[PDB]
Amino acid sequence: PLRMGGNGQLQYWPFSSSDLYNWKNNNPSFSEDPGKLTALIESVLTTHQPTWDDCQQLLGTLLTGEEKQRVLLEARKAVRGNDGRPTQLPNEVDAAFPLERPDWDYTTQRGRNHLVLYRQLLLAGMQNAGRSPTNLAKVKGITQGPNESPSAFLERLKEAYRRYTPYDPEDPGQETNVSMSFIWQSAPDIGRKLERLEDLKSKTLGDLVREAEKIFNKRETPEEREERIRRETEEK
Amino acid sequence: PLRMGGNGQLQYWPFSSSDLYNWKNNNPSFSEDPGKLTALIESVLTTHQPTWDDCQQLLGTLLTGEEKQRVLLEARKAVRGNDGRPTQLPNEVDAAFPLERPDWDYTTQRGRNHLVLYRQLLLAGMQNAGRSPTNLAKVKGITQGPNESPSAFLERLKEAYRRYTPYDPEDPGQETNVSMSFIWQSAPDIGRKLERLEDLKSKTLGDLVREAEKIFNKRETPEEREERIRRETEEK
Amino acid sequence: PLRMGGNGQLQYWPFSSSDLYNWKNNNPSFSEDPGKLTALIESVLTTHQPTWDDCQQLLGTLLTGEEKQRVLLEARKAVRGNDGRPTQLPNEVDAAFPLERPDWDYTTQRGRNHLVLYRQLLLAGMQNAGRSPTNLAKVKGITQGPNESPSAFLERLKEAYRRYTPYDPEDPGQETNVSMSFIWQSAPDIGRKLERLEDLKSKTLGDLVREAEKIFNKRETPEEREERIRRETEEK
């Protein structure tokens, strides 16, 4: 890790093994649920400002051999040339994301910039390695459970988009797409009412969740329903 | 109708009733399939350069009383103020889309500009009146038939988006949304292969149609299949 | 451990015993799987910049008496003279990799260089001690499992090369050799297709893995197969 010392100079210290093992033990494996470790590592990359060697310990400790490999190749595939486009030119790929220890000096602006880029590419690698073979059926299979809140259902639906499509459900250009899945795959009472909303085209994903919550939050308690039935007094 | 005369001056002539009645008789009613008459009228608005009175004959002849009313209110709802935003200010609405004969003189740039705008708003009115209550189930219900070509299926899917959602399936921002429905609702053999395409995220709607056609075009003729079976020679 | 202090001077602190014991407890023994501890120690040698005494604690804590001995003799066997060749000259061997505490002063370039070399030789020792009696049958016995991904299979195949041959499967000169084992020992459907690839000679190990993944990723789901069978409608 690196931190700005009291003297205005970066200061280095190695990761405590307790932190590394705690991070490992409190999360699923990367393969089981890539989002978990990816989010943890994204955070650490910022708070701990790891050097290249530190990143090797992170990866080496939190990922299996096969996972790390996937991530590293994905990171190298994320390198861009000075024209902002992908590049497979060995020297450019090696310079951005070296597989062997680089001579980066954190006391230099040059070293720092490489470290920044390296960390950014590492994150990209994990994000992309966390992707699986596109399978739209998995997205269509996310249906709101009878007790499931609209916001909880939406999070599961977004997770399926992330895992099983190339589309980022948080992109502004995907909003109507996620919105349509949300409406279609909500519980039937909710979906029928969302479909009938006035100025439906104008509803954001957040609007739709709030409208679904109004219906859900109108759940009509089991006790209440039973009481009504009892007071039914209509016989056959 | 108006046309540029041989002397560089606009020339007026009334619609032949044969054209009006032919247009009516060769198309479904607006209610049955709004796209038909809307496209015909959009074309005529250009080729025939109708005046306000001509537009009344068009509407009066091709639409029922109830359809025309819907269209006219939809057209007035499409009027924009000078700030490009909707306006319900009577004077602005009346000036753009008058319900009673205006004093527009086609020999004046002023008259011509009003005519242009009027025609544009009329078209907008028809496009919007042609919309129905949002019903996502209708879009999910468009499934490729066993003999249906991928391009024919895509056109039916787009028609459902137009009729039963507020989303324009031709908008660039809707492409991934339409693409996902196209993949999910294609015939199962096709959908499974489209889902497995390399660099799926990179495929346009046109790309997906071409890939689906390759599979469809690999239909494996009934005769061929039967022949194979005959030459099976595998008994039980 | 050593680290560059805020004053530009190396600073020493002893290993926390919690780190040493955590490293031990979270890994297999060296004998069980040498790669585990070797990779951990390679990392620590960099991040913790251990002195000669620190290295004795590392080895003493993570290895058994018999393992440490193997490693130390292997490290001394890795010493090179100034002509880049092996040397068994006592003074040269002792100077590079001393068995008794040396007078290396980390505040001197002389001391630092010896420390660098010592750590490099220690790593070499572990890498070589981790080797076992050459046994090609073990490499031929690595066969892809029916559920095993091509990348997971390749990692197991490389592990067998490391453990049971003198060849480094990551060497550029071994690529065709590993490639041929990969093709021959892949699952039969995959191997038959890899063998038929156009311009096979041009395929890297990475290319072959990607081609095998396309076949594997075409696994034809059990459910799918069953469905097909049901819809078979061919009786006997």
Residue numbers in the entry:
A (entry chain B), B (entry chain A), C (entry chain C): 1 to 236
Show passages lifted from the paper.
Immature retroviruses are built by the Gag polyprotein; Gag is then cut into domains, and the resulting CA capsid proteins form the mature capsid, which can mediate infection of a new cell. Murine leukemia virus (MLV), the prototypic member of the γ-retroviruses, is commonly used in comparative studies and as a basis for retroviral vector design. The CA domain and immediate downstream residues mediate protein interactions in the immature shell, and, following proteolytic cleavage, CA forms the mature viral capsid. In this study, we have determined the structure of the truncated MLV CA-CTD by X-ray crystallography and have resolved the architecture and CA lattice structures of immature and mature MLV particles by cryo-ET and subtomogram averaging.
